[PDB]
């Protein structure tokens, strides 16, 4: 086995996977009036890249979306797992009543890869956001399988800076437009010194409606 207890009761392989997540791109999510939104920073690298299929925000179904950070290959595997898990619940019961159950299924898979030798832990953190029978939900999940629910949270390299900005300026029941504006300011605050902020990805959903992916022009009128 690889993931074993250290003398002080720590799992080093889990800690090291957390370092891998610290290198990923920054993403954030927050709850607003009757809804929830997700933002992911799309740093431009080269003109030669097809900047249409980046798709940092991935739909799990019409009412659930996720954003990830860290090892991108491991992240794709977990997103696929979440989509299959969501479809299995709908087949068995006819609907998805609580998003928290779906997150726990994903986090249980991640926990399993920290207890059994012969495999390594996923180097990914995820944020899940959507609408269920209880209303707007917002969770994250770390490589160890730890789950928490937030009014607002962030992942990635700039997570510490974005959270501190949200720790001072975030409000509840904000309108969609104002909430999106607040999100950009938090994202801009973590930017590398005097770097410019390129067009990020925006998605939002409101009670009674399906997910909405913001168009490029709509995002353009926010910088």
């Amino acid at each position: 086995a690889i993931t074993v207890f250290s003398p002080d009761g720590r799992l080093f392989q889990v800690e090291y996977a957390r370092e891998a997540v610290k290198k990923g791109s920054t993403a954030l999510g927050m709850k607003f009036a009757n809804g929830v939104l997700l933002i992911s920073d799309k740093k431009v690298r080269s003109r030669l890249i097809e900047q249409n299929s980046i798709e940092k925000i991935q739909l799990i179904d019409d009412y659930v979306a996720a954003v990830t950070s860290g090892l991108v290959a491991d992240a794709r595997v977990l997103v696929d797992f979440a989509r299959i898990s969501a479809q299995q619940e709908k087949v068995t019961y006819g609907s998805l009543v609580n998003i928290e159950n779906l997150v726990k299924r994903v986090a249980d898979q991640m926990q399993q890869y920290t207890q059994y030798g012969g495999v390594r832990p996923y180097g990914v953190s995820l944020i899940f956001a959507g609408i269920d029978q209880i209303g707007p939900r917002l969770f994250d999940c770390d490589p160890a399988g730890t789950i928490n629910e937030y009014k607002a949270t962030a992942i990635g390299s700039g997570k510490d800076a974005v959270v501190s900005f949200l720790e001072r300026e975030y409000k509840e029941n904000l309108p969609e437009k104002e909430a999106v504006t607040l999100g950009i300011k938090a994202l801009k605050s973590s930017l590398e010194e005097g770097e410019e902020l390129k067009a990020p990805e925006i998605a939002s959903i409101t009670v009674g409606n399906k997910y909405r992916i913001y168009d490029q022009e709509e995002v353009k009128k926010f910088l």
Binding site: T92, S95, V97
Partner: protein, 202 residues
């Protein structure tokens, strides 16, 4: 066997008789065919006793676990869907049962489920060998505008008619009323008897 379930404005009424045929004679005059399986959900069983009792135990466990894991009761339609999947999965080695599921989540609901997993929602339904006699009573007398008290009298009359014509049915009538305000309430037999006298059914 005779079971029945009807929907009213904001209530579900379910009722059965109690005769259990075994070894081709009337061995048990006081069986149980109506079960509460959740806070606002009930179930009636017809067919093979052993298969039905196993299914009742499975449903109680699954619904209880669901409510603990997701902090809310399973919706009635999801209860029917879960049952439909389990029955269909063994359709060639089946539970030989006919089931009724009724309850309240945001509106009253009654579902009829067959041995092959076919599930259909209806305003009212009846199962067992006495069911055709019940449908005759319901077709001529049921009304959606009935009060709860009127509905209880209706199901009692329907089952009493079945007991007069279906030899497989008999015994005391059990009745349950499900509402959001009061939950699952099993009517005490003393009121059932009192209504039977009042309705002229001896």
């Amino acid at each position: 066997t005779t079971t029945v379930g009807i929907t009213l404005k904001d209530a579900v009424i379910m009722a059965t008789e109690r005769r259990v045929t075994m070894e081709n004679f009337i061995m048990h005059k006081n069986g149980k065919k109506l079960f509460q399986i959740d806070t606002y959900t009930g179930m009636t069983i017809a067919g093979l006793v052993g298969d039905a009792q196993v299914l009742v135990r499975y449903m109680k466990a699954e619904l209880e676990l669901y409510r603990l894991q997701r902090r809310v009761n399973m919706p009635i339609e999801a209860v029917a869907t879960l049952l439909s999947n389990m029955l269909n999965q063994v359709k060639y080695m089946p539970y030989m049962v006919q089931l009724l599921v009724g309850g309240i989540d945001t509106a009253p609901h009654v579902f009829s489920i067959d041995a092959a997993g076919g599930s259909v929602e209806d305003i009212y339904a009846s199962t067992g060998s006495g069911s055709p006699f019940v449908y005759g009573v319901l077709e001529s007398q049921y009304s959606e505008k009935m009060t709860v008290d009127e509905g209880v009298d209706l199901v009692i009359r329907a089952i009493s008619a079945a007991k007069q014509r279906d030899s497989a049915s008999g015994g005391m009538i059990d009745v349950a009323v499900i509402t959001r305000k009061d939950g699952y309430v099993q009517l005490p037999t003393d009121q059932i008897e009192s209504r039977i006298r009042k309705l002229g059914l001896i």
